[PDB]
Design a protein around this ligand. Sequence first.
Ligand SMILES: [Mg+2]
Ligand SMILES: [Zn+2]
Ligand SMILES: [Zn+2]
Ligand SMILES: [Zn+2]
Lengths: 170, 96, 577, 210, 125
Amino acid sequence: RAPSTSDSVRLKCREMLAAALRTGDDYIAIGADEEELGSQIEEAIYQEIRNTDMKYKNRVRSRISNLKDAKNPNLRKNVLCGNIPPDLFARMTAEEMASDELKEMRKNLTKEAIREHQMAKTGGTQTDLFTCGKCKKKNCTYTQVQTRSADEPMTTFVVCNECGNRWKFC
Amino acid sequence: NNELEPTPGNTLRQTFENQVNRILNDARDKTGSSAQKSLSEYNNFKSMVVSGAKGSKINISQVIAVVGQQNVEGKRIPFGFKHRTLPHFIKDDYGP
Amino acid sequence: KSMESVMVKYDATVRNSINQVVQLRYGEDGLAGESVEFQNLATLKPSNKAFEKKFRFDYTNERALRRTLQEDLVKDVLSNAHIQNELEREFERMREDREVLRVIFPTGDSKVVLPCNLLRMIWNAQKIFHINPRLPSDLHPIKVVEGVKELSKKLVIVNGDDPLSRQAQENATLLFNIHLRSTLCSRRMAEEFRLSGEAFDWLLGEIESKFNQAIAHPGEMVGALAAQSLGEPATQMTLNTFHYAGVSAKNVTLGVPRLKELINISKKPKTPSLTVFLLGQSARDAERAKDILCRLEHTTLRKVTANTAIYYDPNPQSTVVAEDQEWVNVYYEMPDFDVARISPWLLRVELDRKHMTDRKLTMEQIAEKINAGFGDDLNCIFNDDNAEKLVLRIRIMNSDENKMQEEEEVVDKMDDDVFLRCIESNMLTDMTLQGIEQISKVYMHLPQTDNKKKIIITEDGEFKALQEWILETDGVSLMRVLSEKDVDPVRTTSNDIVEIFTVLGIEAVRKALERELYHVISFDGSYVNYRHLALLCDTMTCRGHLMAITRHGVNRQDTGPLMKCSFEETVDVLMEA
Amino acid sequence: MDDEEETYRLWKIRKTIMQLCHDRGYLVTQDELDQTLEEFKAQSGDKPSEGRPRRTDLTVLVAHNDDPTDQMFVFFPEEPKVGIKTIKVYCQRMQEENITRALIVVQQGMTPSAKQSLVDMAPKYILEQFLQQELLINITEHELVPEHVVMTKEEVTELLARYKLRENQLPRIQAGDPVARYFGIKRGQVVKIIRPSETAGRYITYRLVQ
Amino acid sequence: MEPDGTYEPGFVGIRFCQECNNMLYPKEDKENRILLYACRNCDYQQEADNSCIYVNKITHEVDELTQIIADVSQDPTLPRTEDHPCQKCGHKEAVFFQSHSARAEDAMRLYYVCTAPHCGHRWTE
Ligand SMILES: [Mg+2]
Ligand SMILES: [Zn+2]
Ligand SMILES: [Zn+2]
Ligand SMILES: [Zn+2]
């Protein structure tokens, strides 16, 4: 039992959602009432927006398109078998609900790679020779600059980044 | 083979150029460290470096062990010619 | 030529030629730069238990011969209640100073320049008096305590019989005074230095004489002296040599080119940046940091777009692109009346799914952003996020009622395709989706496993450091980056100076400018004594507005014409005078 | 906009101006100081966005320095750019209430005639201008900015005397300086700046406003 | 349909005028759903074929086996390879090289050109 509406627009949006659920006739091998469920979906959406706004229409329409996916009928089957209530369906569980293999894996591995673009980032000049005179760690850096010179000859300057300590070969 | 896999904060070209520079610097430093050790106590050269009179460890490295990667403007020798540094080399030779 | 007129005056406040005050005692402390030396501050001692163990003079003394060691005197003073309260008066003050000193040096560095090396002098007392390091002494601790009070009074650098002057005296020797008291504590003398009473007496006389000698001489041309002392290491090392470090370092100009950039008060630095710090979960999680970074990163639609196309399709319900046909099924109810009004010229955009993911942006936010920017005229619709191809479908609408060729259409019959290119030109170049203003395509995501940052205090009292994420950015909009959520509004800083002034105000420039100068000098490895740098920055800010040391900076100063003519502009200034 | 993030902004500028009022010496509740966004969301009822006030009603009175010169008033206009007309109506409200000092926090830009007229009304009654972006944070908590203390005219008299100076000989600070603006201090007055130091450890300086 | 369908709708600049040989521009017929291309200086007009008149940023016209003219193989300063089997002829002697373009882009991928007269065939690896 779901509340009917007297608005022409809401009624039409309901049959469109029912029409979207009728795709592939999956509802048949379950025998569920896709029109009532669609009405509950629409009502549940309405409970959040409470307007006939574009943002409501877009949200319904994006629900519709995601239900119309030919690459993932198993999502629709999951909704049709009542494993996903309409109030849940009202809000996405994923940025373009794609759970049930294929796209979620692809989206996840894509989430791996874009997070991979930060990981090490990039660091370390890299000699790891001398040991620090403060925090006693051997992870250290060296500078080589100005040759010959007059009174401050080319010396090896060693800095411990690890605590900003700086010394020379001395 | 296109299998190098760029470091998270560089392009593929920059990663390669960073990586060879890391290895060739690492090479000079190992052979450099090796000669300072192989030297004895009587080497007057060690007496001038150690007192702090003139020169440095890297100076010792350069006369006896190996001079290493020359540089200009902060990177390896430029391709003065089309895809070569001197006419003597093959085109697009990124070796040492 | 800028500093030359600055010198110590006989009341000791350093002033320039027109007699304006630069500092109230030279280099903030009255001490000349010839006789100061590096010293360690014992008192930054890590654990609270070790500090209490080391410094507190014991009263719970062992019932055994306990105390006849080190001193033969304590048999005399084991019973005095007053001596117990007075030492407790000393230790609580030390523990209070200890708290003040942590605020002074947030970096937990214990190396400071001071006059009169107290360890070496104390070591000098043991040497001369021939004090056995393992015998009982005749020294009295109250003598030390009162002697140290007496010695502090003796160490006056400027007279103070006045409460303001008395306060100016107390803070202007604070760092030396805590150093003195923490080193010359009763337990320190007793447990470690073993000095005798006359030995202590000589030690007071020595610290007294060398400290008084150390003070700066009024008359010194400290302005001239400071300018050459900074000038000299600038001659040394690195025209423009590069130092490979982390991901960054196409960053901050190094050396003399940075000295010129900084000192000129450049409106257009060669490499402006902000070091942004993060808070909450965002200070320890990579993905959270990714989210804040995304909001910050100035991305424009052009950066995001994979492809564009323009198509001739008057009626969607017969689309020239047969594959688009399903969105028409999808979008028949999308304002169904004005499909009779939309122009037959079509714009189509294709978006990359990986790149769109990295910005974590949604298609509806873009449609709403572009719709809001251009207005209701620019009619936008978009696709299902789960499609393998990402597409944005754009037409252009009008105001319906008013467009009936009233006169000749106030557009001058501009071609509509061509106007659609102008929409595409501007739509890409202008649209600042999520990212707001100019920090450019360039961000850096750094782990500070590097330097001396993100350190705090702990229940142990020690300066356990954190390792946390920070964001280096090539950018200038310091003001907005502070305003954003999860960005630490305390530590976030810039290498730029003109922007620091606008946002934070003249005192913050004095600090940041000293830090930036300090930073170039440390890189080049050579050390410059702090007084000299403080004096330069103070000379530059005194007027209120930043005084670049160039003819458009220092030659606007209300100094006399005859000085200003010998600088650069010469004839023009004499003509103007 | 029409989003909760806006509330956070309104909340955050409210926190900053309250700290500013507090730092000028005015009496304010510590509970107001501690008031979080979730508390605010109920305590002012920032509704669900669209409805009424989150501004005109956010408008607040503050009245507490220890010396009873009586109230200060803080106003948050609605429109993106405020015209002289709204300032004038506001002026009528402050006059009829007989306010002592007004702080105006504007949404975006400023009419140049409004700034001018704001300048010209100053000798009669005194009047401040802040852009909202400058109040989205609290600059006084930044790691670079030292402790500023406004001095009372008498304490300055004692300062010039004890050093034997003249006001002109002092170091200077712009009137239009962000910290000067933040205290809302007027031209001619002196501000005492206290700094951490690498040698004395603590160094005290003074600045004349001009 | 499929995402495998190549992206070449016909960029197309020239098919200029047939009479005075100047450039054609699109222009509308609201009456017949037809695009027309007209010379601006004459009355000549003709319908367009594709509704496409402009695209930008294929972002990947990788240009890997195009423009690279086969005569490149005669160049003595390019590295000959003993690496065998041109993919067309049963003969080794491929000449190879990086990028050779300022969009260098960042490519490190080798391009191989067979050098014996039986091919001229080129291919990436
Ligand atoms: Mg010499
Ligand atoms: Zn270290
Ligand atoms: Zn023609
Ligand atoms: Zn072949």
